[PDB]
Write a protein that binds this ligand. Structure first.
Ligand SMILES: NC(=O)C1=CN([C@@H]2O[C@H](COP(=O)(O)OP(=O)(O)OC[C@H]3O[C@@H](n4cnc5c(N)ncnc54)[C@H](OP(=O)(O)O)[C@@H]3O)[C@@H](O)[C@H]2O)C=CC1
Ligand SMILES: CCCCCCCCCCCCCC(=O)SCCNC(=O)CCNC(=O)[C@@H](O)C(C)(C)COP(=O)(O)O
Ligand code: SF4
Ligand code: SF4
Ligand code: SF4
Lengths: 208, 176, 114, 80, 287, 156
């Protein structure tokens, strides 16, 4: 078990467990999950109303500094009514630790636009608005950045397929470039690789 | 451990301040740069005469996409579809049939030279070393029709040489 | 069931914002068709604009109307700047066929399009 | 030279100048929306068309409250 | 007929459409637009050229991957022409320089070129051969151009009789000849009534007639929608453009309709006027 | 036939004059631009072939389309292509650019630069090795050696 399998530290696990229990006790208004994985990186799962209060707490308080802001994405999970998952990622300059603030959200109701306390979140929020459509009320400027202007569809969803619906070509008829419905030259074959036989017995969900 | 920069002061001693004034009004280290560049002028430049001298390489370059065959034997491929299963732009296209003999073989083995990113995964995935990334890299093709290889083009390209491919593999069949 | 809408209370503010947005598109058209050195009469462009408005008149849900207003405002900004080129503006139009009608027998000749 | 009748005459010939109205058929109780077969789209067209013709900005709720030719003339007589 | 000539699915970008078209010419104006609309249809076009490959290079990427194909032809041998028309569904004949050269007159291009290609075509077994002609090309005077075209008309009518002999009026467009000469002026003023027809309705009519069978044998003529005076049209050109011998005689010669032969209305295509497309094309003036 | 003799000799002189220097413009979107700058490197030369790398579009003899063409890129690419003198030639470098490549099945990507500009010389690879690109420019020069423009003009 020891060679070529990465060992761990239970000490960091106990530290993050006690810290997450502490944060869960002292902000009871929005805490739903505080989960700790095997390799000690914290996850805090949050209702979509305490975005500004929880981030104003987590920027400060001298027990959890966490100035460094990272990724924002809202992992598209169907079979839910609240589809999208806004994932804040926070890194502490003072304590060297990573916490993942996963707040949940639906298709049409906005979360509260974290750019007010995080100046790094501006183009992150603009990117999420362009690729998904998660609206951000009380935001300075929402535009389409990382897509074409005349293109729409919010393509990083699961409803948007791999190929786009439109496809450009130049033509000398109207002496310019026009978009057409997509005419693929090949299929993009689909390999049914989801093999049976239960490779992980621990992660079995209870069937009906 | 840290070793930072730009922590000094301009020295208030008369010699150092008149040396900085001498560099300011006398254009000194500019001429020092001219001297360094003339020292690279008087070197011999390192160029290669391209059509006569070709630049050096490794025995494991990934080029031509050639095929191999058995010693005085038939086609080395089985059409076991591993290369099309691994091809990360799906440029391989295999349609397989057996012939009148009984051993399983092909019908259509197409490499798209447009989509081919030249990984090496089809070389590493081939259990019999049928497809081999070739040695030479000169395609330079005037028409887009001609950049879609057929299996017969690959067999002609594997029968224009094997001795290069065999020498490279026989040198380096021990690393991979 | 708690749902927080964008702007709307009833469809009155929806009607108000969409008529102001159409006024903005009306005073948006001639400046752009003069600026991009286009090739289309102003009547045809305005009629295709109001046809695109009349396409989605079948929506009564107010959040959807709010999101349509926000999308139209976005593209009105991006066309009132010079950020979008001649290609996208012509791409709104359809002057390159695309000839496909909705006849049964026409789709029966060029078949397998039910 | 700015009376009610001159404003009504210039509103009259710009209603003549609008294309889809067939015919003009002016009345003090015309109600060109439903009695003449027009759309609220065409309502806001005519309202901001009068705005384009001869003056002030005519905002959204007052653009909604008119729906009628003589009521437009009287609203301009109130505002101008 | 064999498969892969039947249509397949929708249209455009290597969707396998019906016709395989051998085109003579296509480096000029109308043939280039015709290859463009067949590429929108998604039809394989076999075109031989005689010039530098740079011209067929800047009209090359109209098709999809490997759809159109380029080869060689010459105005002398039947072997190269026959090799170009070995396997063809349809074939169109568009050729002609509007001034005599050292090695070619107005005679024997319009005469000798349809003879040999119609010979190898009728010995080859092609169908729906479309031959262009200028409108009102007579036996009458004033043009070696028009009389050699009338001789070619009689040739294509006599041998291979079920050819679509087609004629537009004098077409205007992005690379017009006579509107360019209207721009390249200085002057002189005459009278002639004239109808101009825009180029895209003409080539839409040609592709619709070549893809729609049962409309064969009949010669067609395309009609301009306005049909007014030439000098009023010149005033219109100078007004929209902001500034105050063979070609000029062949535009002053003859412009009439013929009630014999059918035109646009038996095809079902909308006519674009002079005014709209003329405002579209009259760029390149002072600012 | 000394008329034909003068035509052939003058055509040889003018076409050798064209193919002699051929200064390009480096359009260069993605990492194929880095490999083009590596055939700008001191080992694989460009001085020897009269080839001067130059960002000027107004004087571009040939144009090396390299990188990955996108839908947002394409109208600006053809606007770069238009303000260019009519004697011009195109080298499509890179698997991305000569047929879509590794991003062939995607949105926002034109399936190769064939659908925008005509292509004289395709050179594949990822990246096409600077040695191989220099070979492709040599076969471009041999295409310039076979052009027969003045022959066609004389016997036209
Ligand atoms: N208003 C108009 O201009 C009208 C024109 N037409 C007819 O339409 C046709 C096309 O017109 P247009 O495009 O303007 O003119 P073009 O001269 O450009 O078209 C003729 C084509 O055939 C080629 N060609 C001509 N003569 C020869 C030759 N001797 N040897 C080899 N190739 C030759 C031309 O050049 P290349 O060899 O380089 O390919 C070109 O590709 C003409 O026949 C014209 O009479 C009909 C009605 C109206
Ligand atoms: C170049 C041209 C410029 C671009 C052209 C395309 C522009 C695209 C703009 C898209 C904007 C839209 O389509 S939003 C359409 C809103 N449609 C609705 O039905 C909104 C709900 N409103 C209604 O149902 C009603 O107000 C009615 C029936 C539309 C009007 O009733 P009035 O009568 O009381
Ligand atoms: S992996 Fe090798 S043997 Fe198998 S199909 Fe590919 S080339 Fe043939
Ligand atoms: S090297 Fe080319 S053919 Fe081989 S797996 Fe990669 S893309 Fe496919
Ligand atoms: S072909 Fe390869 S090297 Fe060139 S742009 Fe594409 S990914 Fe980069």
């Amino acid at each position: 078990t020891r060679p070529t399998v990465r060992p761990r530290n239970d000490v960091a696990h106990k530290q993050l467990s006690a810290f997450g229990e502490y944060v869960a006790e002292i902000l009871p208004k929005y805490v739903q999950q505080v989960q700790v994985s095997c390799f000690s990186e914290l996850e805090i799962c949050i209702h979509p109303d305490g975005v500004i209060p929880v981030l104003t707490f987590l920027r400060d308080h001298s027990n959890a500094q966490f100035k460094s802001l990272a990724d924002l994405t809202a992992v598209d999970i169907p079979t839910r009514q609240n589809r999208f998952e806004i994932v804040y990622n926070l890194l502490s300059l003072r304590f060297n630790s990573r916490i993942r603030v996963k707040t949940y959200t639906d298709e049409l109701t906005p979360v509260e636009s974290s750019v007010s306390v995080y100046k790094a979140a501006n183009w992150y929020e603009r990117e999420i608005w362009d690729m998904f459509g998660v609206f951000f009320a009380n935001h300075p400027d929402l535009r389409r950045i990382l897509t074409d202007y005349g293109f729409e569809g919010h393509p990083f969803r699961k409803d948007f397929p791999l190929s786009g619906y439109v496809e450009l070509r130049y033509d000398d008829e109207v002496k310019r470039v026009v978009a057409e419905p997509v005419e693929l030259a090949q299929e993009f074959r689909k390999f049914d690789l989801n093999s049976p036989w239960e490779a992980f017995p621990a992660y079995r969900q209870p069937p009906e | 451990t840290y070793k930072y920069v730009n922590l000094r002061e301009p020295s208030m001693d008369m010699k150092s301040v008149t040396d900085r004034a001498a560099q300011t009004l006398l254009w000194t280290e500019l001429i020092r740069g001219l001297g360094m560049t003339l020292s690279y002028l008087f070197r011999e430049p390192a160029t290669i005469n391209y059509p006569f001298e070709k630049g050096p390489l490794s025995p494991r370059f990934r080029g031509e996409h050639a095929l191999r065959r058995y010693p005085s034997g038939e086609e080395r491929c089985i059409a076991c579809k591993l290369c099309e299963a691994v091809c990360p732009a799906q440029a391989i296209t295999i349609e397989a049939e057996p012939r009148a003999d009984g051993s399983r073989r092909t019908t259509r083995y197409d490499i798209d030279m447009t989509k081919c990113i030249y990984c090496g995964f089809c070389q590493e995935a081939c259990p019999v070393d049928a497809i081999v990334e070739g040695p030479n890299f000169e395609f330079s093709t005037e028409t887009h029709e001609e950049l879609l290889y057929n299996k017969e083009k690959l067999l002609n390209n594997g029968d224009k040489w094997e001795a290069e491919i065999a020498a490279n593999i026989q040198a380096d069949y021990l690393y991979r | 069931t708690s749902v927080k809408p964008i702007f709307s209370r009833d469809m009155n503010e929806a009607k108000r914002r969409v008529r102001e947005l159409y006024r903005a598109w009306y005073r948006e058209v001639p400046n752009t068709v003069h600026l991009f050195q286009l090739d289309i009469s102003v009547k045809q462009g305005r009629d295709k604009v109001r046809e695109m408005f009349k396409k989605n008149a079948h929506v009564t849900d107010p959040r959807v109307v709010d999101l349509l207003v926000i999308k139209g405002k976005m593209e009105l900004e991006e066309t009132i700047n010079v950020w979008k080129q001649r290609t996208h503006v012509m791409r709104f139009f359809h002057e390159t066929e695309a000839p496909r009608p909705k006849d049964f027998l026409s789709k029966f000749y060029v078949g397998h399009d039910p | 030279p700015l009376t009610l009748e001159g404003i009504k005459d210039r509103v009259l010939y710009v209603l003549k100048l609008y294309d889809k109205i067939d015919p003009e058929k002016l009345s003090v109780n015309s109600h060109f929306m439903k009695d003449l077969g027009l759309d609220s789209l065409d309502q806001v067209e005519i309202i901001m068309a009068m705005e384009d013709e001869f003056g002030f900005e005519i905002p959204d709720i007052d653009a909604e409250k008119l729906m009628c030719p003589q009521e437009i003339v009287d609203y301009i007589a109130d505002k101008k | 007929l064999h498969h892969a000539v039947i249509p397949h699915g929708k249209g455009g970008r290597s969707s396998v459409s019906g016709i395989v078209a051998t085109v003579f010419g296509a480096t000029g104006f109308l043939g280039r637009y015709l290859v463009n609309h067949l590429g929108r249809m998604g039809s394989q076009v076999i075109v031989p050229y005689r010039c530098e490959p740079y011209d067929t290079m800047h009209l090359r990427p109209m098709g999809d991957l490997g759809q159109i194909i380029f080869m060689d032809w010459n105005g002398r041998d039947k072997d190269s022409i026959r090799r170009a028309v070995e396997h063809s569904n349809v074939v169109i004949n568009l050729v002609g320089r509007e001034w005599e050269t050292k090695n070619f007159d107005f005679e024997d291009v319009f005469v000798k070129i349809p003879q040999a290609i119609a010979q190898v075509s009728k010995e080859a077994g092609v169908e729906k051969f479309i031959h262009i002609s200028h409108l009102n090309a007579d036996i009458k005077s004033s043009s070696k151009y028009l009389r050699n075209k009338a001789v070619g008309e009689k040739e294509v009518r006599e041998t291979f009789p079920e050819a679509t002999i087609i004629k537009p009026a004098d077409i205007f467009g992005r690379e017009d000849r006579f509107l360019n000469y209207f721009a390249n002026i200085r002057s002189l003023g005459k009278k002639t009534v004239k109808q101009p027809v825009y180029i895209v309705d003409v080539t839409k009519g040609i592709i619709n007639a070549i893809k729609d069978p049962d409309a064969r044998g009949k010669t067609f003529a395309f009609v301009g929608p306005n049909r007014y005076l030439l000098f009023d049209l010149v005033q219109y050109v100078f007004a929209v453009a902001h500034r105050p011998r063979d070609k000029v005689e062949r535009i002053h010669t003859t412009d009439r309709t013929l009630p014999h032969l059918p035109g646009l209305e038996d095809l079902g295509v909308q006519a674009t006027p002079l005014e709209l497309k003329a405002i579209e094309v009259l760029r390149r003036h002072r600012t | 036939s000394r008329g034909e003799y003068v035509v052939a000799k003058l055509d040889d002189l003018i076409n050798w004059a064209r193919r002699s220097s051929l200064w390009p413009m480096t359009f260069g979107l993605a990492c194929c631009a880095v490999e083009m700058m590596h055939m700008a490197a001191p080992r694989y030369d460009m001085d020897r072939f009269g080839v001067v790398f130059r960002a000027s579009p107004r004087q571009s003899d040939v144009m090396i389309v390299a990188g990955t063409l996108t839908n947002k890129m394409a109208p600006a690419l053809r606007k770069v292509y238009d303000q260019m003198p009519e004697p011009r030639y195109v080298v499509s470098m890179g698997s991305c650019a000569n047929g879509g490549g590794y991003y062939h099945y995607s949105y926002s990507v034109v399936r190769g630069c064939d659908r925008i500009v005509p292509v004289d010389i395709y050179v594949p690879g990822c990246p096409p090795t600077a040695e191989a690109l220099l070979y492709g420019i040599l076969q471009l020069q041999k295409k310039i050696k076979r052009e027969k423009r003045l022959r066609i003009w004389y016997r036209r």
